[PDB]
Amino acid sequence: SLESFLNHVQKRDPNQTEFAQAVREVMTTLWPFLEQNPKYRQMSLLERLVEPERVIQFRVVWVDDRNQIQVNRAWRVQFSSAIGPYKGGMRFHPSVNLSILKFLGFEQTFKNALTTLPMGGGKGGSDFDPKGKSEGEVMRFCQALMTELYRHLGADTDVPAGDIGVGGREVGFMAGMMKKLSNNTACVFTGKGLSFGGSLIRPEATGYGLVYFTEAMLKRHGMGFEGMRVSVSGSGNVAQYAIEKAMEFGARVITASDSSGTVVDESGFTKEKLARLIEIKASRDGRVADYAKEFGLVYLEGQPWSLPVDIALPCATQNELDVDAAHQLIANGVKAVAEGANMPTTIEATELFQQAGVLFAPGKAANAGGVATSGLEMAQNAARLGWKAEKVDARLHHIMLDIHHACVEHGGEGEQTNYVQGANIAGFVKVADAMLAQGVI
Amino acid sequence: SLESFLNHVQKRDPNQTEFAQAVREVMTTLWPFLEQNPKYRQMSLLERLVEPERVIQFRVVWVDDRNQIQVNRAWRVQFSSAIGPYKGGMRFHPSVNLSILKFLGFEQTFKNALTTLPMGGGKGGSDFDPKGKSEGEVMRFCQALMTELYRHLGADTDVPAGDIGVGGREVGFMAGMMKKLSNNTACVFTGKGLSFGGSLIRPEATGYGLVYFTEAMLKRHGMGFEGMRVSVSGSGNVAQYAIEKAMEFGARVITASDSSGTVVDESGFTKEKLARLIEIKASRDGRVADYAKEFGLVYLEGQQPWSLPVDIALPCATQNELDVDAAHQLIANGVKAVAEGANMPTTIEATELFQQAGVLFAPGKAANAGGVATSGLEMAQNAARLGWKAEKVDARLHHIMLDIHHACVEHGGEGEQTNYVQGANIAGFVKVADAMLAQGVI
Amino acid sequence: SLESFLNHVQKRDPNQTEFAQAVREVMTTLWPFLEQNPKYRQMSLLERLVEPERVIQFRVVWVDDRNQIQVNRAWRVQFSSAIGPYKGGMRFHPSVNLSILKFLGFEQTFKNALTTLPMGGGKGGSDFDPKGKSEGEVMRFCQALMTELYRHLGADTDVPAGDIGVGGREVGFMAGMMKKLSNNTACVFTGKGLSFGGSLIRPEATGYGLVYFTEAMLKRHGMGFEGMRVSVSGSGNVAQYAIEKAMEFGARVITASDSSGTVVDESGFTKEKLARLIEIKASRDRVADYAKEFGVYLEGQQPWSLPVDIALPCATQNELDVDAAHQLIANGVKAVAEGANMPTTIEATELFQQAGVLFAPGKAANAGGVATSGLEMAQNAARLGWKAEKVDARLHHIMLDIHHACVEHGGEGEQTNYVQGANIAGFVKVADAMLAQGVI
Amino acid sequence: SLESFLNHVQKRDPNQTEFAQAVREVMTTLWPFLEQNPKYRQMSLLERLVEPERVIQFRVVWVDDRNQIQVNRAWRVQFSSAIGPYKGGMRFHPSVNLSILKFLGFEQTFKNALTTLPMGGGKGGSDFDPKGKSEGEVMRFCQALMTELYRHLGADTDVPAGDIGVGGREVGFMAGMMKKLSNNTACVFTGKGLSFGGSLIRPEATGYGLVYFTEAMLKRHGMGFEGMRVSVSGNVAQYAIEKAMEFGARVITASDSSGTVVDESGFTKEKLARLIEIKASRDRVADYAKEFGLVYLEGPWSLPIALPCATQNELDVDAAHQLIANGVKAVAEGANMPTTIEATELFQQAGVLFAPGKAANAGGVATSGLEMAQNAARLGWKAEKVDARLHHIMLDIHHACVEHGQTNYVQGANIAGFVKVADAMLAQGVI
Ligand SMILES: [Cl-]
Ligand SMILES: [Cl-]
Ligand SMILES: [Cl-]
Ligand SMILES: [Cl-]
Ligand SMILES: [Cl-]
Ligand SMILES: [Cl-]
């Protein structure tokens, strides 16, 4: 069954520990669905889905400031182009191998297709370590790498972006060299600067979208983001604008945390408090403890899951929440939980909410805002226009809504809807249904 | 002289029956207009228009399930690109030949221009018979087809679709093979599934546009869909979603039909009844004969709904389904409006004869253009890399149809009736002709 | 220093007068700002900014009606592609040369970037003189010229347009051969007719954009078109629709002129009057004829001797000299906006500023057209046509954005000073993008 | 250094075994030359050489006769392209992986450049199993594979060929679908049928060159192909024997898969005709010997210039010494490194002339280059032309190892193949 499939795939390419785990975590969740609908099991769909459409390894030779020639290996996995062009990020890290990029692009194939946007799946990068390198060395590398990759990308083929090791600067260098060589001014990279093609709300995406998806499911029942106590963890793009958008909604947030402790404001955050926080902690670098002191707020060293709230918005790190912390919240009366980071809740902790009655929102769907806007950026570049914040926000909003409605039609008919299963399936279905109608290949 | 021009043109292809007829029917309506303003004969636009810009005939070789190799011929008539990229559906059928496709293409050219969209005129297909062919074969053919045709297509060059013989399954096959060879995700094919760029109103389009257009035609002559007897033929996208929209406008749809017979429900169709009709007819085997029995409705063994007294007829079945005989009955009964849902559902005789009796007649190029108009929306959505909501696609569709109405009225005689036969042809010819003069030569 | 940098730049182009003049007039205004923010003078931007990315010169050979083979030269100055694809019109005229096209494109760069729309900077044409040519000759030339240029153009590379000697007719002729040769529908030329992918409010563009901008400037300093008497100096698509929009805002337009003379309707302009005028000028040959039909006409004189509150030069470059500036200022002129290209002389311009008169340079007011041509590419990219209301709505908001942009980079004095505000705002967006996109 | 460098290179791919082992054999022989010449260690040249320019992994989805959809993985290791367009056949085999194709390409890069012809270097293939598949299945795979690979090839870019699992049949299918999709009738594949851009002498090539070369080295020291009896083993052995007869010699041995024929007078033009036509056409070596009366062994190294032309490691150190006992003086390989490492250095040290495989059986590769040359000229050379210019190429390869080397041809080949690759790689800036 599940074990046999993985064992046959392992044969194709062992030693890929990362990718082996990727295929395992995805298939496991889809199997209960594949049994119900064998329509997606035939014609070697799963066998073709695990196999990347195209993988590109190429030599990259540049020169450091010591006039010493350096040699690195860059990749770009054209994993899947079923829904749309290969959409994904580029990673510059010395510990990057094919297996890692192969698993990133794999999951990306689903996360992207889940955003309703016509985007494929693919990842890239190199074993280049940007740390210590001057701006010139990082540039010459981006160009030395682009002198080859430029022939493999395109506005309707592969549209990379940013990731670990590749920030707004690197994207600018790659997008620049791309434009010169090809002599084309189409959107080849997303996450660009506002000066040449970048999109607004770029950082505010993940945050706002989180509130929209939470609002989408809440109001679809008998509740809403109105006059509700909201606990929020973490401090960053995901948390900052999640706290703000939650304030634009009737809700009343009362928490925020860092790697150290957590601040508590029973009265609730204000447009000014959040501003004095971000400006003097997210850029100062910085500490959450020094914030509570300023505003005389109650600082706690430990996790804002102790305070009773109607909504919980975990936005810190993968597995930042556990079961025992959930038992306290449910006992109090929490009715909504949405993830901001990767996966703040464990399988055991998540099930503790669902079987309880609490509405849950996995990061696979909630924090989609980041990806959703990288797709809305391509949308702007397509119409030759420059959408203002207001216009972009309205689109990001509806996109987040269609993401919610996508999970609605999956698990279950009643009595309540499961977003964890609804999210895993949604992404697969669109990629699968599309991969079937287009034939072989 | 018209007969001198048509006979002159027919000289190039002395053996294209269906095409020489197309040029006539259109060039016969334009002649009176060519007299009004003779600037449309400036650079011999007539001879420039008639002659297709480019036609690619090629050899498609595949292998059936019997391990036998079957060779087949395919074409792609890229007729006009003045207003936009070549737009036309592919047709897989034994009778398919150059003359037919070239004829359908010339039709599509004006048909697309009339939809106020940046679309040219094209048409293609093959003599390949898909009937009784396993899915593997049809797929194996579509790919063998694209192995050659893919180079002649493009997102801004030629965007085929799906006609007779080429449905969603085939469209996906050609599109899929196109994407593989091209390594490009641009919109090269329309009529795609919602899984890879498809539109929402696509199926409801051709039907909706028909009702959207007809209601407009009626409203202008002090009439209206609501409260009048509506006859419908067929059970496909055209008929189903034409009946649906007809009901919402307060009308009473009486009949629906299959190749087998016609159902008569004078109690009027319903959101409930239609739902079942579409359900059973959705099945590949289902027949309307069973629909009548499930609702105790009158059935007609191998007949047409033209025998009943109706105010508004909506032929949405096959070509030449409404001959002179059936027309005589519709007219004598007191028909006051006839709109063409399907393509060329009426014959020349039955057409002009319908007009003389003061019967509002809306040609296919007009009302039936609702679908092609939506396919243009399918290209627009893909281009913006964003999928619109159903209410947006529908809204735009309605606007487009309303524009097509005014367009026909603007070129319809100043008499009791606009006569959309002359309107559609003129309004459609005007735009293509304008874009041909302004864009040098060639 | 500035002088050292200019003479260093003019080193490569010693006899490119217009180009050198263009670089100076722009660098002079930016220099003070360049001192405030050093980061713009670090990565050697200016030195790179001046040098065009790519300029193509090709031989165009056609045949006149005498069946006599004629030869001409054509260029396509593709200056900067930092913001977007090369945008700029084509110019057919004897005077046309690389020296001119360079400065026309160099300015088109900062101008297009000022309109927010993702458009680069370009400008081309030929020494070909359409004056005294049949359609066949013009067509045979347009097609012969596009025979080579078609390889350097693209919907996402270079989208030229029309200028002097290249009206709507030439656009279609070139776009046609482009369509034929490239077998591509994609938008490669703007200013097209509505017949084959043209945009609505194309002629109203330049005109409306002017009034929309001026209004924003007036409403900024407690003024407005309503009740104010305005002078218009032109007859083309600029003046025709500059007067039209002015009237709607409640302004009484007094003048309208050509190369011959000026007409003076003290009472003001009317929708009816304008219709007849724009129809008379359409027949070619006649503003003097206009005056006679309605009753005065100032032969061989410009409408700058008449008292007004707003002046809208929409005729030819350098039409408003110093002599005309002092007259306006004395009569009671409060604001002046440029409709055509550089209608006001440098000395005359600063003369208005020194007098405390609002001055909207052409680099911002003329944008009403280039922004609309950008909206045309936008409509074509979405594969559908916007209604007049849609185009006019986004065109209005764009001009307002251009005004706002100028306001932010304007002098903190009594008035904004749009000469610097516009010249700087257009430079920034180009600099930022050009910088963040490596080398090159 | 000796191991320091090798470890720094493998750190990028530990799981790759074949490639790691390949880099060692190639580098270990070059270290002396590198130590003597700083201009080749120079600018990270070695660190740029081991790294392949471009590798393309792609999904190939085909369908078998059971109407069952199958999935396979294919590659195209475009290693080096300094000298010219990537050269190297494709391999369809269940045991095919990147680590292998990457080591084959790394070797082919030097073997191709060793032929003095403007050819780059690269290998490729797929884990597709040819064995057990019909013609229709193989066709439908070669097409599904060529559906993506076509965009990565080209006459002036990458011209692949055939190898294990990929014979003249597959080369045809791929070349067909290539010309179809590309609409280009250039030379994108070598080893094409005579009916469409094929090159004469192609099969007689790998055999003739083996002799042309072994003769140039013998006439170098002053030797005669006659006197000393030559043992043989095949596609190359069949024409290697023939050529030796033209120089006037006494080839007295023809080895079977299991057994060996012994002759005294040697093979006459008619005797060979029987030996070759009867051996290949039929399902044996014993029948040939018995049809003539010649001796037969059951298992050719015991008898008194040895020309191995069968299996890899055909000659082991064991039977190797035996050659010394009876007085043989020269040896020349016919397949891909078909000689034991220990046996190799043994022969050399005994005053024996040993011509490596990268130089001997270069006739095949050199001729696949001649096929490209003919196609490019839009005309077909006669059997005389091809054989003639092949002879010159086999001579150039000889007096190339001489310059970088009883002249040690082993040390000469590995160096000559590197020198030209390095020179061009240095002259063509930093890419
Ligand atoms: Cl590094
Ligand atoms: Cl990014
Ligand atoms: Cl058939
Ligand atoms: Cl295209
Ligand atoms: Cl224009
Ligand atoms: Cl297999």
Author numbering:
A (entry chain E): 6 to 307, 309 to 447
B (entry chain D): 6 to 447
C (entry chain A): 6 to 290, 292 to 301, 303 to 447
D (entry chain F): 6 to 238, 241 to 290, 292 to 307, 310 to 314, 317 to 417, 422 to 447
What does the published report state?
These novel structures represent enzymes involved in stress response, specifically methylglyoxal reductase (YghZ), as well as three enzymes important in core metabolic functions, phosphoglucose isomerase (pGI), 6-phospho-beta-glucosidase (BglA), and glutamate dehydrogenase (GDH). All the proteins are oligomeric (YghZ, pGI, BglA, GDH) and belong to three different fold families. YghZ and BglA have a classic TIM barrel structure, pGI adopts an alpha/beta fold, and GDH possesses a core Rossmann fold found in many nucleotide binding proteins.
Glutamate dehydrogenase (GDH), catalyzes the reversible oxidative deamination of glutamate to α-ketoglutarate and ammonia, using either NAD+ or NADP+ as a cofactor. The reverse reaction generates glutamate and the reduced cofactor NADH or NADPH, thus GDH has a pivotal role between carbon and nitrogen metabolism, particularly in plants and bacteria. The majority of characterized glutamate dehydrogenases are homo-oligomers, consisting of between two to six subunits, with dimers being the most frequent. GDH from E. coli crystallized as a hexamer, consistent with biochemical observations, and contains two domains – a larger C-terminal Rossmann fold containing domain and a second N-terminal helical capping domain. The putative active site is located in a cleft between the two domains.
